[PDB]
Structure 1
Amino acid sequence: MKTIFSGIQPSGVITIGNYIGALRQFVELQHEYNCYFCIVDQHAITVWQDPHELRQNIRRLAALYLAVGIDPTQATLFIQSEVPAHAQAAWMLQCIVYIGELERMTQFKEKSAGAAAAAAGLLTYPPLMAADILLYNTDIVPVGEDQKQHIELTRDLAERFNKRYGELFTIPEARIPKVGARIMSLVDPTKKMSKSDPNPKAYITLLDDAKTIEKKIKSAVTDSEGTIRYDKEAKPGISNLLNIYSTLSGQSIEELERQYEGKGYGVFKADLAQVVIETLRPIQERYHHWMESEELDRVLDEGAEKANRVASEMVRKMEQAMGLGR
């Protein structure tokens, strides 16, 4: 089967947009493809972090991913730093990547402009990221359009390493999510729903309680026409709301439009709020079940064990080519 690698940034806050956009699709894909879910804690260490926080988010994220439906026996869920091969492979690749390729990275030139002095990690994470992917012969890397540029570099590195030392790495491919379900901001229909929006009213968290989901959905911006009709550009807000409703309820946008014929927004919002709360309630339950169960570490252990089992052998072949050790 093909292999899919997905890095997860430890922040214990994944939006309903993430869940609708790719996360949920993964709960299904995990049976056909060979999924690798890696909680990249070494990448998260490139910016100031609170030791207690970071450590807490790693558990949350792993717990929340299991809660959403990731099967620890069907897929591999592990913490990056518990697999040393990542740091080892990261170093070797840093030796074949040119300084230019790094300083030209637009994700680099972005944060390297607004500061006096940044961690060298903000300029050297590409080689590490490339390693995360290449270490598992991954074929598909589900990424956003803002990261495509990153997959490009990791592709180049692989190919360059293959020609110089012989075919070993699998040139990965960046596959984008099923198109349409791009959930927009609840306060800015044009802007996308981001976990890092300055306004918490712009997104809904898988952990948001009923009261908040109701408060946030009730504030969702709409328009002045007052009719539940889908239309990207004139009725941005309502269309976004209709999208969220449709994908979480199963009913098409046609059925929903009809179902809310003479209906106003008051009742639409009210109903949408329930379908969201009803979808997250189970997830939230399972989440706490995992958070306070020691079976969590058991899963993370066996995960790091399966990831390492592969990564190690890959790093060993790398060292072989490079000519390190014996």
Structure 2
Amino acid sequence: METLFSGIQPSGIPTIGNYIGALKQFVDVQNDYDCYFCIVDQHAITMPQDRLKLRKQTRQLAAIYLASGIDPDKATLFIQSEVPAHVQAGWMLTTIASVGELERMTQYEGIPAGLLTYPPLMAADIVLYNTNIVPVGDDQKQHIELTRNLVDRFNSRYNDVLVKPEIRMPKVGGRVMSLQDPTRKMSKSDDNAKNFISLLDEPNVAAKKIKSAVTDSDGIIKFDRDNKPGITNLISIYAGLTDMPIKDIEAKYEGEGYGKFKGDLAEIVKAFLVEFQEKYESFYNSDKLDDILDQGRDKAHKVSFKTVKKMEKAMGLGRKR
């Protein structure tokens, strides 16, 4: 069985685009892959953070993943700073990186040193768990390339300890675009709040954003990205939250206009968010949340401990006991 590792930034609420694109797919592939979902608070502080905002956001991300159906027995969901192996192996890999290498990553009071030196900590996050695949995109290519090069350098200079990972998302979900800029991907940090639907938007506010989505005044319910990216995007959201095949949405709305379709979807979005937020609140306001994250932390520690110890032996750190 292949191991998958995904890092999660506690710096913002996922959108429904993030839920359709990735999160809902993870609920399925956690049966077929050995999955690690790591809330990376030690990467978050490379950027300026309000310390209270950060602890709140960490809890929120954990409750959002659990509300999505990430199962803490099938998968390992944990907070990066609670597993010491990450900074232990982050330091080991830093000593074999070069400064020039790191400065080139930057390109692709003064500048915080964390922004130069986090990539080896990212590499450590991944290799500690013998990861085979990482579900990321184009703008992480150079980071995974550094990871693979560090694994080669470590295995070459010391001895075979670490495994090289690959960029692969096992089941690609739909791509959801900005609701009022259909050519741009949806983002949680848009200056135009009408562009995205947050998983924690009020369910009434979300249905309004479906209605305010930028489209023609009327038309056919047909999937056609190049000519009608507005209605097509909404069709993608419809498919993403109902699992109804696209051709079957088309035939269902044959002879219907935009008003009927957008009314129906605004209601689907409202219902999805009502059910989702009920689960989110119960996890987020529960005492079991801390129990869940404790067990996640212990699962990760047991695996990454063995990897760290093999690295230390290969570099001559510590003692032979």
Aligned residue in 2 for 1:94: 94
- Secondary structure of residue in 1 paired with 2:31: helix
Aligned residue in 1 for 2:9: 9
Structure 1 pair 4–179 and aligned structure 2 pair: CA distance change class (3 A): closer
Aligned residue in 1 for 2:183: 190
CA distance in 2 between partners of 1:300 and 1:210 (Å)? 28
- AA at the equivalent of 2:107: K
Residue 247 of structure 1: CA displacement? 2.2
The answer as to whether partners of 1:183 and 1:244 remain within 8 angstroms in 2 is yes
Whether 1:109 and 2:102 are equivalent positions in the alignment is no
- Secondary structure of residue in 2 paired with 1:32: coil
> Which residue of 139, 142, 145 corresponds with 2:138?
145
Whether 1:274 and 2:291 are equivalent positions in the alignment is no
The answer as to whether partners of 1:12 and 1:60 remain within 8 angstroms in 2 is no
- AA at the equivalent of 2:124: A
Aligned residue in 2 for 1:113: none
* Unaligned residue ranges in structure 1 (runs of 5+): 111-115
Residue 12 of structure 1: CA displacement? 4.5
Aligned residue in 2 for 1:283: 276
Residue 262 of structure 1: CA displacement? 2.8
> Which residue of 211, 218, 223 corresponds with 1:230?
223
Whether 1:131 and 2:124 are equivalent positions in the alignment is yes
CA distance in 2 between partners of 1:196 and 1:56 (Å)? 18
Equivalent positions of 1:27-66 (< 5 A) are 27-66=27-66
Percent of residue pairs identical = 62
Residue 223 of structure 1: CA displacement? 2.2
Equivalent positions of 1:131-210 (< 5 A) are 131-176=124-169, 178-179=171-172, 181-210=174-203
Residue 23 of structure 1: CA displacement? 0.8
The answer as to whether partners of 1:35 and 1:76 remain within 8 angstroms in 2 is yes
Aligned residue in 1 for 2:18: 18
- AA at the equivalent of 1:54: L
- AA at the equivalent of 1:325: G
Residue 31 of structure 1: CA displacement? 1.5
Whether 1:214 and 2:212 are equivalent positions in the alignment is no
- AA at the equivalent of 1:49: Q
CA distance in 2 between partners of 1:247 and 1:155 (Å)? 34
Residue 178 of structure 1: CA displacement? 4.0
CA distance in 1 between partners of 2:301 and 2:170 (Å)? 28
Residue 280 of structure 1: CA displacement? 2.4
CA distance in 1 between partners of 2:135 and 2:193 (Å)? 26
CA distance in 2 between partners of 1:251 and 1:258 (Å)? 11
TM-score, length-normalised on structure 1?
Answer: 0.94
RMSD: 1.5
- Which stretch of the first structure deviates more once superposed, 180-189 or 223-232? 223-232
The answer as to whether partners of 2:38 and 2:80 remain within 8 angstroms in 1 is yes
- Which stretch of the first structure deviates more once superposed, 189-198 or 134-143? 189-198
Aligned pairs, number = 319
Aligned residue in 2 for 1:251: 244
